[PDB]
Structures are given as structure tokens and as C-alpha cells.
Design an enzyme around this catalytic site. Structure first.
Site, PDB file in Angstrom:
ATOM      1  N   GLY A   1      53.620  52.510 162.102  1.00 50.66           N
ATOM      2  CA  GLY A   1      54.902  53.126 161.759  1.00 50.66           C
ATOM      3  C   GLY A   1      55.547  52.552 160.510  1.00 50.66           C
ATOM      4  N   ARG A   2      56.593  53.232 160.040  1.00 49.31           N
ATOM      5  CA  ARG A   2      57.254  52.926 158.771  1.00 49.31           C
ATOM      6  C   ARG A   2      58.660  52.358 158.989  1.00 49.31           C
ATOM      7  NH1 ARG A   2      55.143  52.428 153.447  1.00 49.31           N
ATOM      8  NH2 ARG A   2      56.997  52.402 152.084  1.00 49.31           N
ATOM      9  N   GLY A   3      59.016  51.361 158.182  1.00 51.04           N
ATOM     10  CA  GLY A   3      60.381  50.828 158.109  1.00 51.04           C
ATOM     11  C   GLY A   3      60.851  50.807 156.664  1.00 51.04           C
ATOM     12  N   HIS A   4      62.150  50.590 156.470  1.00 48.14           N
ATOM     13  CA  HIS A   4      62.746  50.563 155.128  1.00 48.14           C
ATOM     14  C   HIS A   4      62.315  49.356 154.273  1.00 48.14           C
ATOM     15  CE1 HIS A   4      65.973  50.369 152.022  1.00 48.14           C
ATOM     16  NE2 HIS A   4      65.838  51.683 152.072  1.00 48.14           N
TER      17      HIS A   4
ATOM     18  N   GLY B   1      59.313  47.544 154.927  1.00 48.96           N
ATOM     19  CA  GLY B   1      57.887  47.294 155.113  1.00 48.96           C
ATOM     20  C   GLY B   1      57.230  48.234 156.105  1.00 48.96           C
ATOM     21  N   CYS B   2      55.921  48.401 155.947  1.00 47.81           N
ATOM     22  CA  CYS B   2      55.116  49.259 156.803  1.00 47.81           C
ATOM     23  C   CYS B   2      54.394  48.401 157.843  1.00 47.81           C
ATOM     24  CB  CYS B   2      54.110  50.019 155.941  1.00 47.81           C
ATOM     25  SG  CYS B   2      53.252  51.352 156.794  1.00 47.81           S
TER      26      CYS B   2
ATOM     27  N   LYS C   1      53.241  43.576 159.949  1.00 48.34           N
ATOM     28  CA  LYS C   1      54.185  44.194 159.032  1.00 48.34           C
ATOM     29  C   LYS C   1      54.050  43.593 157.639  1.00 48.34           C
ATOM     30  CE  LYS C   1      58.937  45.460 158.338  1.00 48.34           C
ATOM     31  NZ  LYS C   1      60.274  45.589 158.947  1.00 48.34           N
TER      32      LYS C   1
ATOM     33  N   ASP D   1      72.373  44.352 165.786  1.00 50.60           N
ATOM     34  CA  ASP D   1      71.784  45.699 165.855  1.00 50.60           C
ATOM     35  C   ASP D   1      71.004  45.892 167.157  1.00 50.60           C
ATOM     36  OD1 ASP D   1      71.129  48.326 165.117  1.00 50.60           O
ATOM     37  OD2 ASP D   1      69.683  47.729 163.599  1.00 50.60           O
TER      38      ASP D   1
ATOM     39  N   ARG E   1      66.252  51.475 170.680  1.00 48.76           N
ATOM     40  CA  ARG E   1      65.256  51.633 169.601  1.00 48.76           C
ATOM     41  C   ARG E   1      64.724  50.305 169.047  1.00 48.76           C
ATOM     42  NH1 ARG E   1      70.128  52.902 167.288  1.00 48.76           N
ATOM     43  NH2 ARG E   1      70.828  51.291 165.831  1.00 48.76           N
ATOM     44  N   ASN E   2      65.515  49.241 169.190  1.00 43.72           N
ATOM     45  CA  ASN E   2      65.191  47.914 168.668  1.00 43.72           C
ATOM     46  C   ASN E   2      64.671  46.920 169.708  1.00 43.72           C
ATOM     47  OD1 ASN E   2      65.754  48.542 165.941  1.00 43.72           O
ATOM     48  ND2 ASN E   2      67.953  48.217 166.268  1.00 43.72           N
TER      49      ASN E   2
ATOM     50  N   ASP F   1      63.360  43.423 166.419  1.00 40.22           N
ATOM     51  CA  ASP F   1      64.195  43.752 165.256  1.00 40.22           C
ATOM     52  C   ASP F   1      65.126  42.593 164.838  1.00 40.22           C
ATOM     53  OD1 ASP F   1      65.311  45.502 163.235  1.00 40.22           O
ATOM     54  OD2 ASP F   1      67.041  45.741 164.578  1.00 40.22           O
TER      55      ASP F   1
HETATM   56  O1  LIG Z   1      53.955  51.414 168.148  1.00 41.06           O
HETATM   57  C1  LIG Z   1      53.409  50.774 169.039  1.00 41.06           C
HETATM   58  N1  LIG Z   1      53.325  49.397 169.135  1.00 41.06           N
HETATM   59  C2  LIG Z   1      54.041  48.525 168.321  1.00 41.06           C
HETATM   60  C3  LIG Z   1      54.816  48.848 167.228  1.00 41.06           C
HETATM   61  N2  LIG Z   1      55.313  47.663 166.772  1.00 41.06           N
HETATM   62  N3  LIG Z   1      56.128  47.527 165.712  1.00 41.06           N
HETATM   63  C4  LIG Z   1      56.480  46.303 165.480  1.00 41.06           C
HETATM   64  S1  LIG Z   1      57.549  45.960 164.127  1.00 41.06           S
HETATM   65  C5  LIG Z   1      59.047  45.802 165.003  1.00 41.06           C
HETATM   66  N4  LIG Z   1      59.701  44.682 165.204  1.00 41.06           N
HETATM   67  N5  LIG Z   1      60.819  44.990 165.927  1.00 41.06           N
HETATM   68  C6  LIG Z   1      60.823  46.285 166.150  1.00 41.06           C
HETATM   69  C7  LIG Z   1      61.724  47.128 166.834  1.00 41.06           C
HETATM   70  C8  LIG Z   1      61.459  48.439 166.895  1.00 41.06           C
HETATM   71  C9  LIG Z   1      60.282  49.009 166.282  1.00 41.06           C
HETATM   72  C10 LIG Z   1      59.428  48.205 165.633  1.00 41.06           C
HETATM   73  N6  LIG Z   1      59.710  46.853 165.579  1.00 41.06           N
HETATM   74  C11 LIG Z   1      56.060  45.115 166.260  1.00 41.06           C
HETATM   75  C12 LIG Z   1      55.243  45.351 167.298  1.00 41.06           C
HETATM   76  C13 LIG Z   1      54.837  46.671 167.590  1.00 41.06           C
HETATM   77  N7  LIG Z   1      54.062  47.169 168.532  1.00 41.06           N
HETATM   78  C14 LIG Z   1      52.718  51.469 170.146  1.00 41.06           C
HETATM   79  C15 LIG Z   1      52.000  52.766 169.912  1.00 41.06           C
HETATM   80  C16 LIG Z   1      53.265  52.745 170.719  1.00 41.06           C
END
Ligand SMILES: O=C(Nc1cn2nc(Sc3nnc4ccccn34)ccc2n1)C1CC1
Ligand SMILES: [Cl-]
Length: 288
Positions: free
Chosen positions: A33-36, A38-39, A50, A132, A136-137, A150
Site C-alpha cells: 500500500g501507499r502512504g504520503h 513512503g510506499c 516501508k 492520530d 485506520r491506524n 502509525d
Molecule cells: O496490508 C496488509 N498488511 C500490512 C500492511 N502494513 N502496513 C504497514 S505500514 C503501517 N504502519 N502503521 C500503519 C497503520 C495503518 C496502515 C499501515 N501502517 C505495517 C505493517 C503492515 N502489514 C495485509 C494485506 C492486508
């Protein structure tokens, strides 16, 4: 505020946090997934990696590595700017509760809320203000253990939808989760984290409905100061709603500590036996 309604020292210190380059395979082809800032990608150390956009990166890693608790997302390590985090099988807590193929009970959801409270109790004990806190976090692992995430080097705006730009300062802030005093001053405390936790409990019991539909700006302050709070969700037990109202006390000092919240929610949790299925509200489905 209106509350009544109207460097050798750093290099040796970071040794236990750094991961060697050839002991980490980052799968840049597989995007999580994508964040503002870093990816986030899949990786093998199995983990989440990340990639951010130097002394502050090393310093922030040391502080984060010290935070160890079962309800807080741990730092596995850093790499040079890569942030190595544990992979969370079930992703963020909001998307997990929203998913129509999941069949949570009242007990399950109050349990997730209790876990968050334990995570925040730990963080608050370290004098760390999250700023925050929201469903979602938080993230959820393979044993359905909830991890407050987060923060530190993982800090980002992971869903841009719920961050509004303040007209004077230009800061993009999660206004629907913010305490009445933080909306006015843009200052954050553990007591403002408690307010946010109250909103998070509401998210849990609504299975991830957006708080205050169509009130998206700092004009939430005016709305709140009419004498309003989020309504009691259909599947929220009365005692838990009473707890939410305590989290949103107009006076920050009168809000419960996270210690108190762990106590109170543990009691409420213990009265349920997993017989009450929580279903999604028809008026919140598809609403942003
Ligand atoms: O997406 C999946 N697993 C996954 C994604 N992440 N993303 C991160 S980065 C990160 N750090 N704090 C947050 C808070 C909210 C979103 C991302 N966050 C760290 C671990 C992790 N495990 C599964 C397929 C469902
Ligand atoms: Cl239940």
C-alpha cells in the site's frame, strides 16, 4: 479554549536497530500500500518494509525499538531509508471490521477496543502522545491481536480522505477524531488521545462507519459546541457508550486515564459470551 457549548554516540547506540543489507530481501514488485511519506512493500527478513523518501532517522529508530508491547506495533529494524515492520495478516482495523465477509460479535469488537486501550496505556506510560489514534491506524495480526500503529518511523497519512487542511497553519489534521481543545489550539496530549480513543470505540461498534457524516472541516468545532456527541451505535451496550461520553468530557483533566479505560472496558468485555452478532447500519453503508 471554548469548552462550554455556545556521531560516535548515535552510531554505537543504533547498532541493535540496524539490519544488514544482505539479510533483508525487499520485494519492491509486491506493493502492500501507499502512504504520503513512503510506499509499503512485502519483504523477507516475512515482514512489511516501508521505503521513506539521516541522524533523525537513526534517532527515531532507537526510540521506536525501545517500545515493546503486544498491543503496539514493534520495529523489527532499519536499513540504509527502509523501515522494517512486522507484517499484519489482516491489515488495518477499520477495513477489517468493515469487511462484509467478517462476522464479529459484540465481544470481539469490545475486545479489539480493550486491546487498543492496553496499547495506549503502555504508550501513555512512556509519555508518548499518539496524536492520530483511529481504527485506520491500528492493525491486526494472524491471532487477531490488535496493534496500535502509525507512530515513529511508521507515521503517515494512510487514508487521505480523513485529514483536513487548517486554513491558517496548513497542517492536515484528523479533525473528526480530535478533542475540542486540540481543534482550537492544534496541541495534543494523552487526554486528547483519550478523546480519539472514544471515537475509535464508536468506529468499532459501528463496524467502521465514518464519524459525523458530512462534517469534514474544523467547523466540527461549531457542531460539537452546539452540545453534541456521536450517537450511541445500535450494537453498543449502554456501559460502553457511557465510557465514550467520559472520553469526550469537555474538560481534558476529567477524562479517564487509559489505565481506567482498560479497567472499565475489561469489566464490560467480561459480561459478554459471543452471542450478539454486530451487523452494519444500512444508513452508513457506502458513506465516506
Ligand atoms: O496490508 C496488509 N498488511 C500490512 C500492511 N502494513 N502496513 C504497514 S505500514 C503501517 N504502519 N502503521 C500503519 C497503520 C495503518 C496502515 C499501515 N501502517 C505495517 C505493517 C503492515 N502489514 C495485509 C494485506 C492486508
Ligand atoms: Cl457477544
Amino acid at each position: 479554549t471554548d469548552m462550554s457549548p455556545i556521531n560516535p554516540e548515535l552510531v554505537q547506540a543504533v547498532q541493535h536497530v540496524v539490519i544488514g543489507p544482505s539479510s533483508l530481501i525487499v520485494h519492491f514488485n509486491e506493493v502492500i500500500g501507499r502512504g504520503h511519506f513512503g510506499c509499503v512493500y512485502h519483504g523477507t527478513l516475512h515482514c512489511a518494509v516501508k521505503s521513506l523518501n539521516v541522524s533523525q532517522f537513526l534517532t527515531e529508530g532507537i526510540i521506536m525499538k525501545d517500545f515493546s508491547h503486544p498491543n503496539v506495533l514493534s520495529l523489527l529494524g532499519i536499513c540504509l531509508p527502509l523501515v522494517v515492520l512486522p507484517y499484519m495478516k489482516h491489515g488495518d482495523l477499520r477495513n477489517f471490521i468493515r469487511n462484509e465477509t467478517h462476522n464479529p460479535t459484540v465481544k470481539d469488537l469490545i475486545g479489539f477496543g480493550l486491546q487498543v486501550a492496553k496499547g495506549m496505556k503502555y504508550l501513555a506510560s512512556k509519555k508518548f502522545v499518539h496524536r492520530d489514534l483511529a481504527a485506520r491506524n491500528c492493525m491486526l495480526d494472524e491471532k487477531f491481536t490488535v496493534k496500535v500503529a502509525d507512530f515513529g518511523l511508521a507515521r503517515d497519512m494512510y487514508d487521505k480522505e480523513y485529514y483536513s487542511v487548517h486554513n491558517k497553519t496548513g497542517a492536515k489534521l484528523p479533525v473528526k477524531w480530535m478533542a475540542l481543545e486540540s481543534l482550537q489550539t492544534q496541541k495534543f496530549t494523552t487526554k486528547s488521545d483519550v478523546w480519539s480513543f472514544g471515537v475509535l470505540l464508536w468506529e468499532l461498534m459501528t463496524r467502521g462507519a465514518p464519524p459525523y457524516p458530512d462534517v469534514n472541516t474544523f467547523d466540527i468545532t461549531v457542531y460539537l459546541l452546539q452540545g453534541r456527541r456521536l450517537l450511541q451505535p445500535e450494537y453498543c451496550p449502554d456501559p460502553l457508550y457511557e465510557v465514550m461520553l467520559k472520553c469526550w468530557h469537555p474538560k481534558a483533566e476529567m477524562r479517564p486515564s487509559f489505565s481506567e479505560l482498560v479497567s472499565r472496558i475489561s469489566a464490560i468485555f467480561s459480561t459478554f459470551i459471543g452471542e450478539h452478532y454486530v451487523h452494519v447500519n444500512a444508513t452508513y453503508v457506502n458513506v465516506k
